[PDB]
Design a protein around this ligand. Sequence first.
Ligand SMILES: CCCCCCCCC(=O)OC[C@H](CO)OC(=O)CCC
Ligand SMILES: CCCCCCCCC(=O)OC[C@H](CO)OC(=O)CCC
Ligand SMILES: CCCCCCCCC(=O)OC[C@H](CO)OC(=O)CCC
Ligand SMILES: CCCCCCCCC(=O)OC[C@H](CO)OC(=O)CCC
Ligand SMILES: [Rb+]
Ligand SMILES: [Rb+]
Ligand SMILES: [Rb+]
Ligand SMILES: [Rb+]
Ligand SMILES: [Rb+]
Lengths: 101, 101, 101, 101, 106, 106
Amino acid sequence: SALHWRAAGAATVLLVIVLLAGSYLAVLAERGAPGAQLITYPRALWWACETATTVGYXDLYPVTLWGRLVAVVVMVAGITSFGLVTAALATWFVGREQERR
Amino acid sequence: SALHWRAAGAATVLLVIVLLAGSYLAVLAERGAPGAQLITYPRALWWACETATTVGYXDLYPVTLWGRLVAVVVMVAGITSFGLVTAALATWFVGREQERR
Amino acid sequence: SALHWRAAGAATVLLVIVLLAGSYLAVLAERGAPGAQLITYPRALWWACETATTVGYXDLYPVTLWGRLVAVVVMVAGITSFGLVTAALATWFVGREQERR
Amino acid sequence: SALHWRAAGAATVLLVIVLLAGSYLAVLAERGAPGAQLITYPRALWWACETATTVGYXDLYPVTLWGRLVAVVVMVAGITSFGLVTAALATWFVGREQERR
Amino acid sequence: DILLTQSPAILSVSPGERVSFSCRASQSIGTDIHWYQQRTNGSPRLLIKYASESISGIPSRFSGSGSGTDFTLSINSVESEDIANYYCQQSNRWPFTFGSGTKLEI
Amino acid sequence: DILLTQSPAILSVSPGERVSFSCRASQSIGTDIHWYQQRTNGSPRLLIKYASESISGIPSRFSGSGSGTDFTLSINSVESEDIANYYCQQSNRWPFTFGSGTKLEI
Ligand SMILES: CCCCCCCCC(=O)OC[C@H](CO)OC(=O)CCC
Ligand SMILES: CCCCCCCCC(=O)OC[C@H](CO)OC(=O)CCC
Ligand SMILES: CCCCCCCCC(=O)OC[C@H](CO)OC(=O)CCC
Ligand SMILES: CCCCCCCCC(=O)OC[C@H](CO)OC(=O)CCC
Ligand SMILES: [Rb+]
Ligand SMILES: [Rb+]
Ligand SMILES: [Rb+]
Ligand SMILES: [Rb+]
Ligand SMILES: [Rb+]
């Protein structure tokens, strides 16, 4: 269909993928660092969600270089994804409006 | 009226609904988990607000699977709602501007 | 000038106003609640900034009903303001682009 | 090329610059304040990233006046940058869509 | 889970005097502490909520204070009807728990 | 790293009685504590996970509780097959660590 809606859907699928690889790689990055808490997968996936929506309570966060790099990727992927949706909703609204007139 | 403005209003009403069901379901999800703090309704509604605006101080957050799922829904509903408003403000601005010219 | 740019500027001035009244009203709301930390003005203004940009480290946050209500207003004013700017940048970009073609 | 895409790229380069000067100036601002933790550069750069994406876990944050001012600049630069990208994605989507029709 | 310690378990005061019951939490609970009075053969009665907020129907003589881990229930000028056991209860974290109780003796 | 203290190291109870093993963490670990049983010459056996969650194949007699720094593994009406050593293990922070062990004697 319309490009904007395809880019949106694509971004959402990709986000779900970044959340899962992000959870996997965070645990992999953080185990081995004394004091780290981002070390079991169920809570890491939750950590990935709250990082992507940029909510960041946090209750958990990375302390190593690679966990932080993985964190930045999750952030960016979520901020970009949510931004692509807004943008598509604007495209849709601009079109229907030019019609309503 | 204009579709964009209707989608906005609709999203706002829906957000208020997600904040209230979200507060109710968070307490329901979290009571029963030792150490949980998202367990009385007034503070849960406040928790719901700060999660939807993605501010996340956090001072409170869910520790169970269902409280976290409820958290993700509140996040998404708020991010989508605020995004729908931006998008409608863009639609409105694009139209008046094409006129000013 | 263009409506979008005026709404933006207006939103920015209004935000600066909400940050200052917000700092004042937060201290007023929170003094009187045992344990509260949002009680001197310089740190409350900083709290107001980090709430409006939705960064929320959190290092400080309201614990009373009125401080939280004041918090929600600051959040919304900042999210709306930053959203109005994005929207104006889109309006500007849409126009110059239709020209470049 | 298109103005929107140039403004985006420009904002991204500028953000990378604000993140690096921001890390440098935060350490400079915070050393000298008893209890401050934003005092070595690797963690300050990470702090700068999580502030710009507005994630704010938080694990670290400024406690001085100048560190906070530097914090506000990083916030604003990131919020503006990410907003400029959304806006450019909307411009791109609006154009291709008017074509698809 | 949160341990609430009430000590001493028995407090003896002279008619009309100022009495203070203490409740100490094992970890910080903001102001999420509530006080109850249970007279001999009676059911518990809420006296103060959220550490310092008054309840309707309770004599003005009763007051509460504290935040964090240390809490006090105070009685200004105690009288005979105040003879009872007094309990604190926290709602900050699941599950809710009760302190072991302080008896007021005159 | 997280120190898990199990005390006393030896617990003696009468057949059928209620027994409670204690595990205290050096800092707060939510409910990230797990319990194992290791009989003489045997390999450890998971009894309870996340402080209070039951495992399949383990008698209902076994239960756990606690959150934060203090944890208890309880046995309702102990019997002979329960004679063993009992260990707690935390997974809240890296690296995982084990408590020193409590022996059950009847
Ligand atoms: C996208 C931005 C990601 C920023 C990640 C920062 C990680 C800081 C760190 O832990 O780095 C730890 C190491 C030392 O162990 O510091 C270094 O020498 C690395 C230079 C950055
Ligand atoms: C929209 C994304 C929501 C993510 C929610 C993650 C909750 C993690 C959790 O507490 O899960 C707890 C349970 C164990 O009690 O882990 C599991 O086996 C469930 C698999 C996810
Ligand atoms: C825009 C949304 C703002 C939400 C603010 C929630 C404040 C909760 C609170 O502290 O409320 C404290 C009081 C009791 O002191 O609870 C009540 O009976 C008030 C009902 C909400
Ligand atoms: C863009 C907004 C930035 C806000 C920064 C607030 C810093 C507060 C502070 O630490 O200020 C500390 C000083 C005292 O050391 O307070 C003052 O007299 C300064 C007046 C603001
Ligand atoms: Rb945010
Ligand atoms: Rb945040
Ligand atoms: Rb946060
Ligand atoms: Rb936090
Ligand atoms: Rb945003």
